[PDB]
Symmetry: D2
Subunit: 305 residues, 4 copies
Amino acid sequence: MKVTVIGAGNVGATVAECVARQDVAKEVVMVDIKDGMPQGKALDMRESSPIHGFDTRVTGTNDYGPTEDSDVCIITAGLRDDLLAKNTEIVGGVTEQFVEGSPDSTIIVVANPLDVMTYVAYEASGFPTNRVMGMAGVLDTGRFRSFIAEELDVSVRDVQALLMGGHGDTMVPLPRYTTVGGIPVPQLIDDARIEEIVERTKGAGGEIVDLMGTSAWYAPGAAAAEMTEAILKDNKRILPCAAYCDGEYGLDDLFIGVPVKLGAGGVEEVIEVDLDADEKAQLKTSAGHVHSNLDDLQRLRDEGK
Amino acid sequence: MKVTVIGAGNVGATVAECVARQDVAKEVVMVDIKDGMPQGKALDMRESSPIHGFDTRVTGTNDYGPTEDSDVCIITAGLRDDLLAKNTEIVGGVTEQFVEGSPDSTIIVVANPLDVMTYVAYEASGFPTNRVMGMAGVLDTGRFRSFIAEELDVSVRDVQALLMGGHGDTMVPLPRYTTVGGIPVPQLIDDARIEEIVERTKGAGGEIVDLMGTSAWYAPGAAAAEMTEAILKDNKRILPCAAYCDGEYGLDDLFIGVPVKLGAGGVEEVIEVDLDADEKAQLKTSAGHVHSNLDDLQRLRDEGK
Amino acid sequence: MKVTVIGAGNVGATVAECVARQDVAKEVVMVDIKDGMPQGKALDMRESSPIHGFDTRVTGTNDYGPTEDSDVCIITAGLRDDLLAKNTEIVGGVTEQFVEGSPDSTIIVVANPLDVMTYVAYEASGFPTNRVMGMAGVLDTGRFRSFIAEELDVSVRDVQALLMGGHGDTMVPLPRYTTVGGIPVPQLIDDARIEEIVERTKGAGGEIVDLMGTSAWYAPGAAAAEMTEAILKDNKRILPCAAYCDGEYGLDDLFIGVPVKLGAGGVEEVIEVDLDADEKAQLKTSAGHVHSNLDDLQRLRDEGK
Amino acid sequence: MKVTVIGAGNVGATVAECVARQDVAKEVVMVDIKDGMPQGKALDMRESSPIHGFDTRVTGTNDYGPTEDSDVCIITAGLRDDLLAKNTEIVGGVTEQFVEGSPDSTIIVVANPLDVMTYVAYEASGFPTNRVMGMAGVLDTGRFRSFIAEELDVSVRDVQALLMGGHGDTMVPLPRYTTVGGIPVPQLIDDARIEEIVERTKGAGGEIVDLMGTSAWYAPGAAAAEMTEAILKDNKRILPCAAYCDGEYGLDDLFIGVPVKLGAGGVEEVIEVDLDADEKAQLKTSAGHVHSNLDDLQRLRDEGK
């Protein structure tokens, strides 16, 4: 099996290196427009291979030829209307370039705004809906779990969480569907502290930008690599991702963050969890925000932007 | 760090090999009364070490000298009144033999009946209550999770469960504290099927005996090795184990299956989860059964048995 | 990918569990004639899967239906003329039963006498020579490396060794092709001690039988599982195995222990290392012994045995 | 156990993340002068911890307080006379700052020029010679092995190599002490191709700089993390590192690249491999170059630089 990562910056390179370390794929190919960068990073990773002990071949290139016949593609290239326009162009374009040579692939998008970029890639791909998804929920939940584990001083291995919706303010937290060793977290942490943690999770990306002046990559890269492993292994992970919904949660014709079953078939099922009145209202708001962005897309298209 | 496993039969040898494969401990020592068995198994494991790639030294012996200054001890030696008498003698005796040379150790008991044998070891040890525990819940939950994952066709990595109480009929299942990707399992599986799975979990040990004519070891060994890793790593796992309860769940002066935080301090906390009326009634019944066994212990002591 | 293990005794079950723990194959199937044993062991392994964290499905059966469309098969069923006759019957028979349903598989034999049983399986298989091999060298080298690492008090990770030929007296040790952190072992250990270690390696199987009264399984199982991983991953391991030689080392028409490149194509290359006069003489003797066994095969066939 | 990494740039952060992923240390602390960078990177790594599944706590700070009572320290801070002066100041200074709070630590230096910086740190540390070493050989050998594995199309797991001396032109390659599955590489690759690979290894750092415009970090970080693991695990790895030599190879009073045994005692032994006339001449030249740098140090000290 063969994996392509589009974009060889911090996030893309992290995806590539994490997939290569798993030693499941035969090859991982980084493609990027910047001459020499994917080549240098790939060479550095290959030189690390005997030390870590993986045989996955890592390649870097500026052309799409070497990405041909890929099984999985992770799209990380990407920098309100200006951004939507700029990233739409980047994501749509690289998707077109990629799918010509890999018609049987499954695509994982990591570009903002994430739910809308997932749709942009789906449309440019010509693939069925199950073959395109976005990484967000796994990062958001990894963050939430890390904060919970820190608060309780418990192993991260025993904290599980479900989060839905979009990123940031439109992210939909589900503390009652967050557990520690099977125990719902509201039994262990009080409401005010849970709400503090929810707010930190919503702003987590910006928090890191504020500290170091650029956005995260270790956790975003790990999250996309986990989704890649599930596809390659066909192991049926249940993870929250940006996925096409047809009727679930009463949403339709929409890519948004939902729990899914992931395997060789891409998004094999969208799981429907019970949401109470307030949670439905939050999800409705988040869906409204995705539709707003979709509307802006067409307006910007109309205007030649 | 150094680990002793008392008993070099199928379960003990599995504990030893699993701990050695983790490559955390410097040494693992199997001690057993049968001349040549722990020696042969340890030699076979050492000869496997370059193939698997672990440096943990595995030793086998018939004497307690080589177990001295151990950090963790897992007691697996062990074959109603006849059994209680026989295993009490074995477990109490090996505990006495062991603790003389390892006064600073933490003990994990794997002998039936499990809750009572955990007490027998505690009493023979002279250790504080936090330093002695029994393996049961991790095996029971591993079983329950495996059945759930099989039923839903989902990754075992995404199924979590909490079970309390004793083994078998007195095991206390908590399906509402069982989740798949964060989603409570009763939302996904209907009541009749959940009850089928609960009953299979209760009888799981006997099921294997009925198939192959002797009791399990891969899963019991893995479970005790997981508990050992938590102590060695001080990683604060939240796991159900037979632990001393002082007031939790309204139980007192009692070792029974409860969720605990495990680390270098042994049982560092007993976590109290919310139990509804029926669950409390089930736990009360299970506690009653442990007390019955404790009563039988003293009767058999009185009678010279 | 799918792996079958024929024989669910100590060695076969170890192969199965080790392959399942690697979490590379989708399924591992143990087949054995003894009702209930493979079923019980497979169930125990499945119940361990959430504790260890693997999604490979382990199945046990008494029939060959469930082994169909396997990619790799490891044959471990098997108990001088009496043994050769008995194991020839077992190995030839199970091979016939297996290949009917898995015509595209690669076979790894673990039955004694190993070089001759590898040929017996090849003949019963109808497969090309590259698709059938025997496990011996990886076990012998794992043993030799473990003894060297113990003698020097160095990591097993840094000791490498090459051994050729058959098992036991006809095993061909190559101390000058044995290194520690790249340093040939004769520079570190003196001749008399190297010869002690060579003799221990030759008798290692019997040593364990003498200690515990039955033969090893942890290291033999690990060795066959390593060979299985190489095929599944197509990672091009260079390992000593019983392989068909056409001209290499001047041997012809012969399965015997040689360094090979292993990948998806089975034995992809037989590597020819330089042997000095004494080493050639030893290999010639070992080949003579394999031919003797091959001769006995046909004599026993002639005699209706 | 606790690990400090001085410098939170690409290399230091890679060391930290690699050590944290091993899940052996309780805590890893990155310290760096740049406000916010180690904090941001550490937060990103902590948020990745539930996804990868490690409990090692990663901390970032601009002060040395949080590094106190560290067991291992990896020094990666650091940018001919100008460089020697600049890095001497950085390395000596951070060493002084660090050892005040961690008097029982072992130090691994990753700053250029590597052999001389290892001495600078040793002198600033007040530690015995066994407690200070430099990372170079493991990176150089990882590179050489990767090139060999690529050339032969074999697993990196089966290629081992020994390299001594300094970095670059003064690096001392030992192709006859380089093996593939135990087979010396000159038996498989011809002289001209081996020399090509040796020259590529010598210039490997510059090759990457030439491709991407900045120096490597995946492989350098992996190499220092491997050395850290050996100390933490006390596993007795035999690896080439910059270590203090007292009489070995006829060198004296000198830190230079040699094969060593690494464990809890730091550099526990310097192993002496047999060198032929040409190899001795190469090592003598490399030692001459280290002494030249040592001489320059004192000249620059004399001159107030």
